[PDB]
Design a protein around this ligand. Structure first.
Ligand SMILES: CCOC(=O)/C=C/c1c[nH]c2ccc(OCc3ccccc3)cc12
Length: 209
C-alpha cells in the first residue's frame, strides 16, 4: 500500500508554494514562485537515516517523530529553488484535503545546520466542500528570517556557493490532528538552487527505514 503522491489516506497535499509579489503587482499582477508543489507509480524511497543529522534531535526531530509513526506519513521533498526574481510581499500557501473532518495543527520548523532556528505553528479548521473537507492556509506572510535569508542568498556570486549554504538549510513540516495529537503528514525539505532559465522544480520521496 505504497504512496504515489505526497499524502496519506487521511490527509493529502493539494498545493504548496512560497512566492513573492513585487510592489508593481497592484498595477500589473505577477508573482514569483521560489518553490511550488501542485497535485491536481509509487514514489522513490529514501532511507530516513541518511538525513538524521540535517534535522532537530531531542523532541520533534526527524528520528523521534519517525519513532512515533505512522511511518507511511513521512516524505522527503527536494527543491530546486528559483532564486532569480526590494520591498514586496513574501508569502507561503498550503492546502490539504481529507475524507474526515479534523482540526489540523501545522508546524514549520526552519533549521540551519539542524538547529531549530525559527518555528511557526498554525491551526486550520476543516471547511466542507464538494463531498470532502478542505484545509486552506493561503498567503501566510513569510517569517522575516526566511525573507532576509533569501536576499542574502540571492546576492552570493556563484551557484555552487548558493548550494553550499543551502546544504545546511532544511525545513521540517509536521501536520497533526489538533484534537487527537496523532501525526498525519511529516515532510523534510532539502534545498538546492535552480539555474534560473529553469524555474523551480522538485522531487518527492517516501521516507523509509
Ligand atoms: C508561513 C510562515 O512560515 C514560513 O515563513 C514558511 C514555512 C514553510 C513551510 N514549508 C516550507 C517550504 C519551503 C519554504 O521556503 C522555500 C525556500 C527556502 C529556501 C530557499 C528558497 C526557497 C518555506 C516553508
Amino acid at each position: 500500500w505504497q504512496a504515489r503522491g505526497l499524502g496519506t489516506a487521511r490527509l493529502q497535499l493539494v498545493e504548496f508554494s512560497a512566492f513573492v509579489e513585487p510592489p508593481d503587482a497592484v498595477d500589473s499582477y505577477q508573482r514569483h514562485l521560489f518553490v511550488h508543489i501542485s497535485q491536481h507509480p509509487p514514489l522513490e524511497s529514501v532511507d530516513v537515516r541518511q538525513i538524521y543529522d540535517k534535522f532537530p534531535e531531542k523532541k520533534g526531530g526527524l528520528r523521534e517523530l519517525y519513532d512515533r509513526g505512522p511511518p507511511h506519513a513521512f516524505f522527503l521533498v527536494k527543491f530546486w529553488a528559483d532564486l532569480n526574481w526590494s520591498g514586496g510581499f513574501y508569502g507561503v500557501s498550503s492546502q490539504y484535503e481529507s475524507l474526515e473532518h479534523m482540526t489540523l495543527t501545522c508546524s514549520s520548523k526552519v533549521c540551519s545546520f539542524g538547529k531549530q532556528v525559527v518555528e511557526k505553528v498554525e491551526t486550520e479548521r476543516a471547511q466542507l466542500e464538494d463531498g470532502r473537507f478542505v484545509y486552506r492556509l493561503l498567503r501566510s506572510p513569510m517569517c522575516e528570517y526566511l525573507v532576509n535569508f533569501l536576499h542574502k542568498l540571492r546576492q552570493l556570486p556563484e551557484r555552487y556557493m548558493m548550494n553550499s549554504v543551502l546544504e545546511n538549510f532544511t525545513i521540517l513540516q509536521v501536520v497533526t490532528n489538533r484534537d487527537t495529537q496523532e501525526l498525519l503528514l511529516c515532510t523534510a525539505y532539502v534545498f538546492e538552487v535552480s539555474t534560473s532559465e529553469r524555474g523551480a522544480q522538485h522531487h518527492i520521496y517516501r521516507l523509509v527505514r
